[PDB]
C-alpha cells in the first residue's frame, strides 16, 4: 500500500509492453511523489530516468516524467508540488545581482542520476526541438536545479554537446515569453563562472538580444525580467576581458548610456522603488565590470567609456538631487572605476561644474568644479544615510589624483593658499579640518576620518614624490606653530574628550607621518610638552577599552624609532624617557594587545568593507582606521614591537 504500491507502478513503468500502460504507471507514481517522495525517488527514480530515455518521442510520456521529477526534487511546503518559485529563486541567489530573500541528500540523488553520464543532460536539451510549451519549459526548470545542485557536472555535460548554448540562447526569441524569461534564468546559471560558456554566448549577440528585451519590457521600469536580463549580462562580462571588449566595441554603450539616463531624461519625474534601484545599480555595475582595474586593457576599456557619453549620464546620476541615497554611491563609485588612474579623464574630470546642492537636508543657483562639491560633501554632508556617499566621494576623489603627481602637487599648494587666504582676508578644505580646534567634531566625527586619511593616501612613501607632497603640508603655518605640532595639540585636547574616532584618527595619522619621515619625527620631537601628555595619558585606568592606550604608546615608540642623535629630542636621551617610565616590556605588550584585542583587532581586512559596514549601538558605522595605516601597521609590526627592544 506504500512498499506493495511503489515497486509494484514502478515495475509496469520499465516492464510494461505499451508504451500507454507504461505511462500510466507514472502518472500513478506521480500520485505518491508529494507524499511518499524519497520512496518513490529510491524505487522510482532509474525507471523513471529508463523509460524517458525509451518513450523520449512521445510528448504524454516525457511531459508526465519531467512533472514527476520536478515535484519530486524537494519536500516543499507550498502550492507548487513542482516547487517552481524556489527554483526561479535559486537561479537568482545563486547567480543573480543584488537578490532579495530545503535541499537535501534525495535533491542531490536526482541531480546525481540526471549528471551520471550526459546522456541524459543532452536528452533534455534536445527536448527543447519539441513542439509542446509545458516540455520546452520544464525541461529548462529541471536544468536550473540540477544547475542550482551539480554546477559543474550539469556545466560539463552541457558543453560537451556543442549546440546546447546556441539552442539555450535562441529561447529568447521563443514565441511563449514565460520561456524566454525562465531562458534567461538558465543562461544566468550556466554562464556564470565559466570562461567557456562566456566564450559560447559571445557568438549569438546576446548583448543586442538582451537589451532588446529590456527595452521591450520597459528599462529600468522593468521589475525582475529586466533584473535578470542585467544580471545575465554581468555574468557574461566578469572577468572575460575580450567578452568586455566585444561589449564595448559592438554599439552597447549608447544602449548603456539611455538605459541609465531614463531617471535623469525624464520630461515627467521618474518614482523609484527597491526593484528599480536594484535595476540601475546593475546597470551601473556592468560599466564597472569592463574597467576591471589592474588588467592590461583596463585603460583602453576607460578611453572607449570615455569616448562614449556614459562618463556625463554617470555623473548627472551622481548630481541629480532626486537620486535615491542607495544609487548615488554606485553611481560616484562607477565614475571613480571609469576615471582612476587615466589622464585624459582625470584632465576631463578636472573641467567639469555642478549646480550645487546638499544631499544630506531633509534660490540663487551658484555652480562649483566637481572636485570642490565631492570634498564638501565627503567633510560636511554629515547625516546617517550619506555616510555611503561620503566614502564614494572619497573614492572618486582617489580615483582623481591617483598616478597624477602634478594634480596632488597642483591641488595642496591651492588648498594651503585657502588656509593661509583667510589670514590674508583679515567650504572645502582640507587643511581647514587637519589644523583648526572644531567645538563640534563630536557631531561630525567622519570629517577628520576622511581627511586624515586623503593625507595618508597622497603621503604613501612608493608615490614616487611623496617626500614633495609631505613636506608641503609640514609646513603650515597656523597662529607661529607648523602643522606636526599644531596636530599633536589637538591630539592630546582630543584624548579626554568622549568620541573614541577623533584620538584614533589623529594618532593613526601622526604614527602614519612620522613614521620612515626623520623630518617629520623631529618636528614632532621639537617641543617635549606633548611627549609629557602622551607618556602622562599611557598611564591611564583603561575602563576595560584600550585601543587608545596602545596607539598613544605606538607614537612614543614609533617616533623613537626614527630618532637619530640630531633629534631636537636626542635619540639616546629620548630612549631613556619613555625606558625609565613606560618601559620595554609593556611596551611590546601594548603593540602585541593592539593587534589582538582592540578596535584594531576588529579590522574586517575586507578591501570593501566600508561600503556595507556595520552600524553600531549609536547607528554610526563602526569604522575607526584608515585602509593605509592598517597596512603600514600589518607590513611593519616586527620593527614597531622592535622599537625600544633593539636599543
Not at 294 to 304: E, P
Not at 497 to 504: G, L, N, S
Request: one cysteine or more; a negative charge.
Amino acid at each position: 500500500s506504500v512498499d506493495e504500491t511503489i515497486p509494484t507502478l514502478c515495475d509496469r513503468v520499465e516492464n510494461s509492453t505499451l508504451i500507454s500502460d507504461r505511462r500510466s504507471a507514472v502518472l500513478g507514481l506521480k500520485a505518491f511523489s508529494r507524499q511518499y517522495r524519497e520512496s518513490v525517488i529510491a524505487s522510482g527514480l532509474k525507471p523513471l530516468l529508463n523509460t524517458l530515455k525509451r518513450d523520449y518521442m512521445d510528448e504524454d510520456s516525457v511531459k508526465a516524467i519531467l512533472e514527476t521529477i520536478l515535484i519530486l526534487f524537494i519536500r516543499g511546503d507550498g502550492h507548487d508540488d513542482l516547487t517552481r518559485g524556489w527554483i526561479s529563486q535559486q537561479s537568482r541567489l545563486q547567480n543573480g545581482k543584488y537578490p532579495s530573500p530545503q535541499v537535501d541528500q534525495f535533491s542531490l540523488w536526482i541531480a546525481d542520476a540526471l549528471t551520471q553520464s550526459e546522456d541524459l543532460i543532452h536528452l533534455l536539451v534536445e527536448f527543447w526541438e519539441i513542439d509542446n510549451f509545458h516540455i520546452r519549459l520544464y525541461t529548462i526548470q529541471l536544468l536550473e536545479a540540477v544547475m542550482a545542485t551539480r554546477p559543474l557536472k550539469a556545466r560539463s555535460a552541457l558543453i560537451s554537446l556543442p549546440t546546447s548554448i546556441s539552442t539555450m540562447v535562441s529561447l529568447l526569441d521563443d514565441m511563449h515569453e514565460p520561456i524566454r524569461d525562465e531562458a534567461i534564468l538558465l543562461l544566468m546559471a550556466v554562464v556564470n563562472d565559466s570562461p567557456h560558456v562566456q566564450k559560447l554566448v559571445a557568438f549569438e549577440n546576446i548583448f543586442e538580444r538582451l537589451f532588446s528585451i529590456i527595452e521591450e519590457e520597459g528599462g529600468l521600469r522593468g521589475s525582475l525580467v529586466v533584473n535578470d536580463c542585467l544580471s545575465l549580462i554581468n555574468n557574461i562580462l566578469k572577468y572575460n576581458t575580450s567578452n568586455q571588449t566585444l561589449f564595448l566595441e559592438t554599439g552597447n554603450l549608447p544602449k548603456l548610456a539611455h538605459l541609465l539616463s531614463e531617471p535623469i531624461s525624464q520630461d515627467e519625474v521618474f518614482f523609484w522603488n527597491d526593484q528599480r534601484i536594484v535595476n540601475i545599480n546593475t546597470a551601473l555595475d556592468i560599466v564597472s565590470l569592463t574597467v576591471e582595474p589592474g588588467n592590461t586593457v583596463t585603460t583602453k576599456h576607460q578611453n572607449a567609456l570615455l569616448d562614449s557619453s556614459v562618463l556625463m549620464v554617470v555623473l548627472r546620476l551622481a548630481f541629480f538631487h532626486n537620486i535615491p541615497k542607495k544609487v548615488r554611491p554606485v553611481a560616484l563609485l562607477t565614475a571613480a572605476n571609469m576615471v582612476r588612474s587615466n589622464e585624459h579623464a582625470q584632465l576631463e574630470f578636472s573641467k567639469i561644474d555642478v549646480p550645487y546642492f546638499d544631499p544630506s537636508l531633509p534660490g540663487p543657483i551658484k555652480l562649483i568644479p566637481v572636485v570642490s562639491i565631492l570634498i564638501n560633501w565627503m567633510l560636511y554632508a554629515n547625516s546617517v544615510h550619506t555616510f555611503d556617499t561620503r566614502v564614494a566621494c572619497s573614492r572618486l576623489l582617489k580615483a582623481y589624483f591617483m598616478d597624477n603627481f602634478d594634480l596632488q602637487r597642483d591641488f595642496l599648494l591651492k588648498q594651503v593658499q585657502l588656509c593661509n587666504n583667510s589670514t590674508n582676508n583679515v567650504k572645502a578644505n582640507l587643511f581647514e579640518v587637519l589644523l583648526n580646534y572644531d567645538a563640534e567634531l563630536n557631531l561630525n566625527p567622519f570629517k577628520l576620518f576622511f581627511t586624515t586619511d586623503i593625507f595618508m593616501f597622497f603621503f604613501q612613501q612608493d608615490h614616487k614624490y611623496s617626500e614633495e607632497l609631505r613636506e608641503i603640508t609640514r609646513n603650515v603655518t597656523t597662529g607661529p606653530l607648523k602643522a606636526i605640532q599644531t596636530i599633536s595639540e589637538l591630539l592630546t585636547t582630543s584624548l579626554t574628550a568622549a568620541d573614541i574616532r577623533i584620538p584614533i584618527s589623529y594618532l593613526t595619522f601622526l604614527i602614519y607621518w612620522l613614521f620612515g619621515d626623520f623630518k617629520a619625527t623631529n618636528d614632532f620631537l621639537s617641543d617635549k610638552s606633548v611627549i609629557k601628555s602622551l607618556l602622562s595619558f599611557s598611564y591611564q585606568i583603561q575602563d576595560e577599552d584600550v585601543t587608545i592606550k596602545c596607539l598613544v604608546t605606538m607614537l612614543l615608540g614609533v617616533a623613537y624609532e626614527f630618532s637619530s642623535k640630531e633629534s631636537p629630542f636626542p635619540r639616546k636621551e629620548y630612549f631613556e624617557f619613555i625606558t625609565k617610565t613606560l618601559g620595554k616590556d609593556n611596551y611590546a605588550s601594548r603593540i602585541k594587545q593592539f593587534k589582538k584585542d582592540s578596535y584594531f583587532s576588529k579590522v574586517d581586512m575586507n578591501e570593501d568593507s566600508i561600503l556595507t559596514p556595520e552600524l553600531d549601538e549609536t547607528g554610526l558605522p563602526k569604522v575607526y582606521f584608515s585602509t593605509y595605516f592598517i597596512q603600514l601597521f600589518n607590513e611593519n609590526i616586527y620593527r614597531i614591537r622592535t622599537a625600544l627592544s633593539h636599543d
